[PDB]
């Protein structure tokens, strides 16, 4: 559980800062889409629940 938690924390930290998203940086949009694809939201909600 700690391994997976650390992995998710690292990915979240790697996630772009918003100002880049508003700027429209394609690299930021990539990274965010890749992170979303890796981790589905439903699983995060389940773990939180």
């Amino acid at each position: 559980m700690s391994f997976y938690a650390a992995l998710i924390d690292l990915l979240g930290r790697c996630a772009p800062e918003m100002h880049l998203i508003q700027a429209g940086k394609g690299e930021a949009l990539r990274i965010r889409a890749i992170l979303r694809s890796l981790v589905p939201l439903d699983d995060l909600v389940g773990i939180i629940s």
């Binding site: 394609g26 889409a33 890749i34 890796l38």
Partner: protein, 221 residues
């Protein structure tokens, strides 16, 4: 000399799959109209069953470095390993792309591969990498070479899925080796070339070879 893949050339992407201890060659295919998803057409039997190669042929439009692609997105040529290429379906004049959708039950992280109407965006572009250390980045891509295709947007390889009994094509973090086999490079004026739709006329452009019209008794045979 050894042939070099260049732009404006038509190529087919072939993969190899071992089934029943019998290696089988498959060409990437997509109709484009009514269906955008890519599938695989077997080219091995050919002698006993002709393949549908027309919807498998792709033409190379652009081969650009990552940086040039970036500038262009913000705003003939030989292929080099590490470049990004744009592939156009000859029949539909659409563009090969990595789709955001995924129906694969086997792989959760895979993406569907299919055609897109507009060359705009990153999904259309793919990067070629050498399958072996033999070839190196910057080297001109040569006919026969095993290649690795990576989606610019998704950072996922073009992959052949054999997990299900049926063979499928998807974008996955696993890699598959693809061969770019050429169909045509450059043709002189006139000078009929294979793979083109044409008419056969008996004489002075009056009569042509044809079959019966629809709803005929002969069953159009």
């Amino acid at each position: 000399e050894v042939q070099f893949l260049r732009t404006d050339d038509e190529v087919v992407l072939q993969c190899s799959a071992t089934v029943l201890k019998e290696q089988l060659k498959l060409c990437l295919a997509a109709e484009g109209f009514g269906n955008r998803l890519c599938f695989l057409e077997p080219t091995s039997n050919a002698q006993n069953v002709p393949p549908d190669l027309a919807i498998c042929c792709f033409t190379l439009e652009q081969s650009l470095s990552v940086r040039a692609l970036q500038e262009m997105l913000a705003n003939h040529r030989t292929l080099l390993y590490g470049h990004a290429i744009l592939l156009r379906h000859a029949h539909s004049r659409m563009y090969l792309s990595c789709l955001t959708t995924s129906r694969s039950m086997t792989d959760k992280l895979a993406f569907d591969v299919g055609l897109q109407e507009d060359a705009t965006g990153e999904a259309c572009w793919w990067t070629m990498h050498p399958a072996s250390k033999q070839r190196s980045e910057g080297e001109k891509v040569r006919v026969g070479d095993d290649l690795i295709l990576v989606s610019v947007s998704s950072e996922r390889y073009l992959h052949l899925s054999t997990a299900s009994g049926e063979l499928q094509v998807d974008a996955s973090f696993m890699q598959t080796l693809w061969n770019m086999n050429p169909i045509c490079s450059c043709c002189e004026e006139g000078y009929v070339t294979g793979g083109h739709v044409l008419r056969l006329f008996h004489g002075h452009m009056d009569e042509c070879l044809t079959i019966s019209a629809a709803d005929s008794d002969d069953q159009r045979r």
